[PDB]
């Protein structure tokens, strides 16, 4: 939240379980979209598609974000998007130094 | 912005092979070039700052509907980041890559009659910088070897000594030359100096600064590819390999 | 600014065909550029000279 | 026959055709929103005796922190807005703002760029032509209220025809003395003081009896679609600031006393529908320009 | 359950970030903006946290 | 001798040559399918007191959520659909839709852009030329049903030549009074009220007795290959909407009262087969435009 | 000079002022939905070899279970719809159906009752005024397509003034032979076969030569806001059925061959913008009456 | 759209829905007819007191 250049990523198992999908959806829903890379975004979509659409990682390896989103929506999964985080303006009172 | 970030002959040529011709052209009408204008630069002056519009600015401008205009728009995109307004070219030509237009006879475009003197004059070369001139000379070299005009390219360079001094050294048909080349062709990048959010007087400088500050925002955004952190996530086709070479080279 | 595919139909919708194709560029020194019409009023050489011939007649 | 017409309807110069897409209209919408917050923060700073609210608002607007010894001019957003305003006014004005700059500033806030949510009422009275016979004198003065002075010198009563165009929705005519007005090929009613006319009815004929001059005061109202954030008072002030700042000094352009006359004159021209869309965007930009300049002043 | 907890406890974490940034001086913050990094979290830890 | 022709067959302007490839034709089909679902979702949502079916339909079509206080134009698809219609009508109309936008929008639905699955019947009657000798006046009026009024002022009976082109399949001629019709170098039969002719048979000769004027009513049918989703009723309404909306205001073009007259006129022109293929794609585009604009008026 | 006018533009009779409020508009929309379900139910009943789908639809529409030996008439809703249609046509209709019954029937289904959701295009051509000088003859025939036959018997060319009103959006003029047309006090262009004009522009002048007649065929398009469930084909069929059934037989009224003629004629009156609102509600009522009567013949 | 939905629901006594003209409900009709009544003594008063 403090530093915008910082990023978050996670690595999943070769055969994901329900825990991996829950972790992927929680990261997409609640972490800032500005902190999730495009490569990480595709990896999360691949993990979701592997568990839900009953496919392996090699089959969906050469798939774009548009194709993965379409595959997941056809199955009935709506969480295929990244959500930008609102910015809160903060002020530090001066006291004995110039403020920030 | 992506084209202006390429710093080597390999990266620049690889990008031109991937991108299509529609990126080089623009669908905004813009204004006309070579026009004396009064622009507003209030951070410096109260009056209106005079300047002259050109094809090298990063703003779209109306262009001629001929092969000469098409080549000027391609070089403008490479050296400035935006092209011109030449519509109704045809979907057959617009699908092909910029490199294919420049160095392949299969496209169907005829560029043999093009003269490098007026093209350099129109794409104002007295106002370019060293990096911009190098990219233009790359495009001239690619075109010359396409139509078998290598001798004409050499004579043109011998007439203009400063262009010869900074002319990149590579044979358009050989990939070993591209690998060995160590010219710096980057117009935008992470600056060692202090880059501030301030305006510049000239049209060219103001637009160039906007691209520079834009690249910093894009560099720190989520669209940038940090190789040291996520090299195992890229597909195998687009992964960096030394065996990789341009098609037909 | 336009190319055509080989082994395609040669018919075109328009009945009047320009010497310079849809690309609107003619390589100088070719036959097509030689048979192109010349501006007489706009060109100072041709207008000056034309008056000389009419005066002689 | 002698012909007279409104001064402000003569030769409307063409308007710009650039920065009229979805992204550009979004950028102008963002500029107006951030300019409004700049004015409010300056007030909040003054009643609170702390520079913190103003600094934060300026940081959003200019993407930079204010520093002493450097004049606060608005940064890159002010530069883009000023040059874009010039481009809207005339087709001779250059387009020198890159697209990557417009996209960057449009993303600073999440507002809709739609410019047709609401409407506004404009008060300029369009008199396209007034035709009078040989022995009569007609003079037209004014734009917010038009005074038409008519004198009859000949022996007989004269017939003067009035054309108000097809854009205005209503026109109200009041005379110094009661007078007769009726549509073409219609009977003339009893002399009255006021008339309410729809300009689409057609040319109107007014009988001018011989004697003292007759003066008609014309008031018109027309409706133009504008964004819901459109404020007429702010737009007029921005129009005057732009004219005084010297950014309407382009070659071969017409000058107007208010934004009311500018938008109506462009409406009463060929392809007037397309010109009005561009002029509405320029009006919102002038609203942003006014608020930004008052917040950050120069002497 | 994740949504309900997030809506219940966002105020406390918003205050926490504000307090932490209050501890950083200005010169240190601008210097830290030049650096960048990516943090790797195990999937079990991410779900258990929420 | 005098010649007269149908008004709508004169000087067909060149149609556009852009957005006729496979991917572009898939875009028009995708727009047609999604614009139809917009109409059905509106009816279902209204009847089921829930707006959730409409939100899904609009989100798929426009790539953004429906929000109040917004015009609800239709997103990028409405812009792309509007511009391709303008480029189809004329060859000087600029093509300002990127190929990336076409492919991105075409991937929303899985359709085949084949424009030769089915056929449609068009009722415009192509009277190419009527040749009349001296002291005879011939006048042609109408396109859906042509009325040819001929008067014989001269002393003797005259021969009027009819040329219906070579494209139409059947032309039915009815007269106010019985008349004689036969092909070139054929015996003239007894006077009848109606005639069925094949335009490929040849020029037709009509005898004109001296006296009261003779009026002939001509009805024609032509078959043109169209996609299966083609609907003539929707195309006609969409054609009128486009003309009203100003999509065809490009200079140096001709204007027609209906799509039936437009498609037939281009067929009776040089490179007619190539022209008709473009006009069919414009027809499906106009049908998608009608459904979308009725769902989302602006 | 002489004056010529369209036949259907003469004396539009006043329309009804009852059943215009929101509750009544809801009833008409409810009737259209329920009447439509009647037709599809019967088709489903025939295909499924069972009358249960039709029984449920009729019970909802008529509030009475169908019986084999008893005639099916539609019940109270059929009577209310018939009486409502009569009230709309003329201001002199009794308007007997109460408001409590209207509210009860409107509760049968959940519909918007929105009269301005969408639009439709009407193809009737209004020719308000044709001015012809002496020694010329002008005749106007047609409503969907208007043919103006003009013949000049004078010495020189004559000027004919056209006036298409201010309501229509675009008018396309087609001539039997090329002719010259321009604005009032405007230079003439070269002779062309077709013209596209906006009626709001002003009266037009047609130069009529001497010797040969000229016929101008005009087609016009007008946009009128209508509900999203509007269907021109069903409305026109309902219009003819209501006329035959005698619902429009009231003293001191005018009669029209098409619904487009009816709606356009009232839209040219002095209070036309208020008359169309009643006309639009009447059209949707005729839509329900068409579907209801075909499924339940009298 | 939450602030607008709450305000419009209060004004028009109806939840805003898509595919509706957003006229304003009974209050807009009452407001319009009342304005006509004030201007002239000839204008009808067609708004019930209840």
TrEMBL record, chain B:
Pfam families: Seadorna_Vp10
Domain of life: Viruses
The name this protein goes by in its record: VP10
Organism: Banna virus
Organism classification: Viruses, Riboviria, Orthornavirae, Duplornaviricota, Resentoviricetes
Automatic annotation (TrEMBL), chain C:
Record's protein name: VP4
Superkingdom of origin: Viruses
Lineage, highest ranks first: Viruses, Riboviria, Orthornavirae, Duplornaviricota, Resentoviricetes
Annotated source species: Banna virus (BAV)
TrEMBL record, chain E:
Top-level division of the source organism's lineage: Viruses
The protein, known as: Vp2
Organism of this sequence: Banna virus (BAV)
Lineage of the organism: Viruses, Riboviria, Orthornavirae, Duplornaviricota, Resentoviricetes
From TrEMBL, chains F, G:
One Pfam family in the UniProt entry: Seadorna_VP8
InterPro entries according to UniProt: Seadorna_VP8
Protein's name according to its UniProt entry: VP8
